[PDB]
């Protein structure tokens, strides 16, 4: 959504240190662990029995890098998240049939993962900036639902 000029820079800065592939697998992995019902969409992924299994699942990691790579690209379009994610929105609603609530939940996990990996650097203002980002991305992906 509307971040301030400084918030947009805080986001941009922090993200320059983010290994998208790793944070992607980590974030999606924790989503399946903390909110196990999200696993409903990934039966084909194989072993998702324990946290160590989910986190170590190669399909989970690979899907996580895909999901976060798309999220990453969208950061270059902060002022038009609705437009940049429109196609993905239709796909998640029409083909994938994914409840938008899942996007909000992954957003919660992503923030926890950033806080975790960055520590003190992920300050309250930096968090506020990313809250606007994950909320905007979730609203943008949910927008074309019908």
């Amino acid at each position: 959504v509307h971040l301030t000029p400084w918030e947009k820079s805080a986001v941009t800065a922090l993200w320059g240190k983010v290994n998208v592939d790793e944070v992607g697998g980590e974030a999606l992995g924790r989503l399946l662990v903390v909110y196990p019902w999200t696993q409903r969409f990934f039966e084909s992924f194989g072993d998702l029995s324990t946290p160590d299994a989910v986190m170590g699942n190669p399909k989970v990691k690979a899907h996580g890098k895909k999901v976060l790579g798309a999220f990453s690209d969208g950061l270059a379009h902060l002022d038009n998240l609705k437009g940049t994610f429109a196609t993905l929105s239709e796909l998640h609603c029409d083909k994938l049939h994914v409840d938008p609530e899942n996007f909000r939940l992954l957003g919660n996990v992503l923030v926890c993962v950033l806080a975790h990996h960055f520590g003190k650097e992920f300050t309250p203002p930096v968090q506020a900036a990313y809250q606007k980002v994950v909320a905007g991305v979730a609203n943008a992906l949910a927008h074309k639902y019908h």
Partner: protein, 141 residues
């Protein structure tokens, strides 16, 4: 916690729904599908048009579970045991959706129970639906 007054209010109003429980369940589903399109993500295998055989079928199932819950308001977790199992381990309907259907079941009842839907009964019914939802979501994590 459903007070004795809540249980009396609930049983009276549900008692009034009676033979229409099936028709009401199907109507609440439709109200939900229309007002909150996201909920349809759980029914891609359903024909969701008005008067659908699947909607009618599922609406009767939903209503029957509610009838059972009301007849056992004093021990719902036990009465809805296989049901909380089904939603937690198979369906995996995100918890936020339960409030949407509760809202629409309330609306449906309001539209059908002119005399019965007093503010108090309205309050008791809201609590009851939240209880059923709490139970149905009890084994997710």
């Amino acid at each position: 916690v459903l007070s004795p007054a809540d249980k009396t209010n609930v049983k009276a109003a549900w008692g009034k729904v009676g033979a229409h429980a099936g028709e009401y369940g199907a109507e609440a589903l439709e109200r939900m599908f229309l007002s909150f399109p996201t909920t349809k993500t759980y029914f891609p295998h359903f024909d969701l048009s008005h008067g659908s055989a699947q909607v009618k079928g599922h609406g009767k199932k939903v209503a029957d579970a509610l009838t059972n819950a009301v007849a056992h308001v004093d021990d719902m977790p036990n009465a809805l045991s296989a049901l909380s199992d089904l939603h937690a381990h198979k369906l995996r309907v995100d918890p936020v959706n339960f409030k949407l259907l509760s809202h629409c079941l309330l609306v449906t009842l309001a539209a059908h129970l002119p005399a019965e839907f007093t503010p108090a009964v309205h309050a008791s019914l809201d609590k009851f639906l939240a209880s059923v939802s709490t139970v149905l979501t009890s084994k997710y994590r």
